[PDB]
Amino acid sequence: DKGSVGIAMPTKSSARWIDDGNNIVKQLQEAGYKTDLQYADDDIPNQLSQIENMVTKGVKVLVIASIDGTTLSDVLKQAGEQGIKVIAYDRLIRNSGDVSYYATFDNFQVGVLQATSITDKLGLKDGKGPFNIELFGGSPDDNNAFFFYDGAMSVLKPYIDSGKLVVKSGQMGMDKVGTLRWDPATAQARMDNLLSAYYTDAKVDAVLSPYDGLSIGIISSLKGVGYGTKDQPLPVVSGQDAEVPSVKSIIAGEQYSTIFKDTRELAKVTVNMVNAVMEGKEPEVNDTKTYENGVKVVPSYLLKPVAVTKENYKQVLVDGGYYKEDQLK
């Protein structure tokens, strides 16, 4: 037979990975492969055990979206010893030469888009400012978080340097703005304490949020101190993943933007890679320079993300079939 593919997803607490998993499995099975899809509920030891089982089971290919890829070094070595090819899915797996390919969206560009939605809304290109902004990052054990952050700062930093953007808290850098495990409650708490320490007098004009789940928590915090009223509008808040609650928030004129990353397209890239490996061919890659993982630069294929606001949500999210119309009502 064609062989089996082991698919390891990190959690279901962030909505996308259910879609990733469903789409990867649907497309792999259509392609004639057997699949073993597992979700780790954000438990690092359990994800490792799940991957060990796939290796022991003798899958031909592993597709892994890791909570913390650095913990997988030994199991990926074992996979390599058995001739199993490893595709890092969405998040780069670091500290392992046993990672063959990396399928993802253009993570730096995601950051550029997140920051640009904010700077465009604030009218910074038109010389407006100063405005107060606070920064959030993803989980520091997620290689993507650094790219989202760096991508955003490529747009933001020039305005911070010129004073047209002011980080009133002074908190910058992933070691200070990172949100462990991409946890909304954590981000909401940080927002609470940013507001009380730095914005009891002044107002926040924007918040760089790298993920929809965080955006919603950040917004709750802001409403907690009086934002989101007619007199006092919410600051401009970005996002990622186009989760339903965030899309509803955008439609309602609350959260400002998000980033659409079509998991159907990422699954398709993944199936193309699996097919190539099975056929003894080289997978198509479009970036062999960016994704250093500590041991090597993993050959990667990057998909182009799409910024979404209340202006384009229908065309981007509904007309293209990602969601049904009624899901957003």
Ligand SMILES: O=C(O)[C@H]1O[C@@H](O)[C@H](O)[C@@H](O)[C@@H]1O
């Ligand atoms: O866990 C999360 O929320 C985030 O994880 C990142 O690695 C994904 O690229 C992003 O799409 C998710 O929003």
